[PDB]
Amino acid sequence: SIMKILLIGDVGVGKSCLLVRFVEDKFNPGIDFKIKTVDINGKKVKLQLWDTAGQERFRTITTAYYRGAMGIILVYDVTDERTFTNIKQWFKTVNEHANDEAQLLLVGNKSDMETRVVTADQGEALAKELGIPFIESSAKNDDNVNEIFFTLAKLIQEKI
Ligand SMILES: Nc1nc2c(ncn2[C@@H]2O[C@H](COP(=O)(O)OP(=O)(O)O)[C@@H](O)[C@H]2O)c(=O)[nH]1
Ligand SMILES: [Mg+2]
Ligand SMILES: [Zn+2]
């Protein structure tokens, strides 16, 4: 089966690096997606994982972008208060444009940085306000990245 999963949020928060860590298991930094197959309940699920450049940032406001998407991950940077502030607007825009059975997930990235300004309780609180699950991650330190996609994939398959 195919699960189309999108990463959404401000430029610079680590969307691409989260995607590279999940697929490649490494931190480093014209085809729009990567395919990674994962076992859920003993059955192969192929995730179709969408990441677009800030360059291409303009699509996220269109319903075309979310065509067939079943998971959407909203990402902010724990080091950047503004990217966290901006999450309510991302939520709203996603709900305006995506399938209503789409499962969403909040991710606070860069948990490795001692310059953190957004607490885990803050992220937890926002997540309840939006009615969604919440995970803190570090693409750099390899912390909680696989959990992001497995958590979301399991929620999507329970929908199905
Ligand atoms: N310390 C730290 N830096 C990160 C992490 N993830 C990404 N970065 C850096 O933040 C910048 C933005 O990452 P990127 O994946 O391009 O963000 P995008 O605009 O959301 O796709 C790059 O310089 C990354 O090296 C992380 O988990 N920890
Ligand atoms: Mg990117
Ligand atoms: Zn790893």
Numbering used by the authors: 19 to 47, 54 to 184
From the publication, what sentences describe this entry?
Crystals for the mutant Sec4pV29 were obtained and the structure was solved at 1.9 Å resolution using the wild type Sec4p bound to GDP as a model for molecular replacement. Some of the crystal contacts are made through interactions with zinc atoms that are coordinated by Asp43 and Asp166 from molecule B, and His121 from molecule A. Besides the presence of the mutation S29V, the P-loop region from Sec4pV29.GDP and Sec4pwt.GDP superpose almost perfectly. Furthermore, all the interactions between protein and nucleotide are conserved between the two structures. However, this new conformation is held in place by interactions with symmetric related molecules and is probably an artifact of crystal packing. One of the most intriguing observations made for the Sec4pwt.GDP was the interaction between the Arg81 of the SWII and the Ser29 of the P-loop. The side chain of the residue Arg81 forms a 2.8 Å length hydrogen bond with the side chain of the Ser29 residue. This interaction is not observed in the Sec4pV29.GDP structure. The structure of Sec4pV29.GDP presents a very similar fold to the wild type protein indicating that the decrease in the intrinsic nucleotide dissociation rate is not due to large conformational changes. The difference in nucleotide dissociation rate is most likely explained by changes in the protein-nucleotide environment created by the hydrophobic side chain of the Val29.
Sec4p is among the 11 Rab GTPases identified in S. cerevisiae and acts on the surface of membranes to regulate transport between the Golgi apparatus and the plasma membrane. Therefore, the structural and functional analysis of the mutant Ser29Val of Sec4p offers an opportunity to understand not just the basic differences between Ras GTPase families but also how Sec4p is activated during its GTPase cycle by its GEF Sec2p. In this work we have investigated the nucleotide exchange mechanism of the Rab GTPase Sec4p and how its GEF Sec2p stimulates nucleotide dissociation, making use of the Sec4p mutant S29V corresponding to Gly12 in Ras proteins.
